[PDB]
Amino acid sequence: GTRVFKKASPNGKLTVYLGKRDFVDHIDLVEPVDGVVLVDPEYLKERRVYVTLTCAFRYLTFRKDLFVANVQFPPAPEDKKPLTRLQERLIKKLHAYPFTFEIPPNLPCSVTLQPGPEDTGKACGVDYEVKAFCAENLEEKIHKRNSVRLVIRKVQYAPERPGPQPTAETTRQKPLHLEASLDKEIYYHGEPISVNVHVTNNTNKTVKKIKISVRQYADICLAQYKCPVAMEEADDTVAPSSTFCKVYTLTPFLANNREKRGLALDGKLKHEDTNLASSTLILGIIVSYKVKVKLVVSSDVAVELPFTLMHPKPKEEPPH
């Protein structure tokens, strides 16, 4: 069979059904946020029922909106076309009528910037709230009455099939030649990123220290946020006039990262744990990652590789 979400209003006078909480972007398109609402004609003297989709943002504080969309009980006289396969089965199962929202391409994804412990308000980020309501006037000051708020997510995960290798070259001045590369285009949360490091130091001075980091890039446009999610400060030295090779390994995980106020996480529904933000393949938050190889000489040198931190396309179900 299957399972769905069925939040209803505080006074029994309205109910929202959703098939799921997450919607996915195949890059050039976006899934429709599609559901049905049960309506009560016997309460509904106001004579109109409407549903809202809102791509909000939260950041004293600012609450913005990046996208707002609305849809028509009594049934629309002509807009019967976009009824989705999911909705028709609730229609069969139940006085309930569709609501649907095709978020346009080139809009941000479900990103929860951290709820830093020092703050207690609603979490920052691009939260998708679907808000079904009954009203007499679409301009009325919406009270806590028969409306039902429900947060959703719109997300992106692993780009299937093989892709280009994050090979890189950088040299400084004889040459201090630095090369690094990974083994895959895409990589996954919490797994080891295989960091290769070739160095040829024709200078007199020693490479004092080597840092590998994996760094989180999240562009905020309501600016961009930069923070290292992982780091390996190996002691290996490229001795003067030598050829060097080493393979490093790092794993980025949230566990240590919780204290770094302002990181970005995959969209929280309520307060449940999620992975660090899957990369975005535009307003809002656009998030991507790189593996960084740095050499410290007794005076730094570095190379920085395009790293796609993501999650496999989950075939079984969404997170939770």
């Binding site: 069979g1 299957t2 399972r3 769905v4 979400f5 069925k6 098939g19 609730l90 429900l150």
Partner: peptide, 7 residues
Amino acid sequence: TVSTSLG
């Protein structure tokens, strides 16, 4: 929020 089945 609450849950349920399809069909």
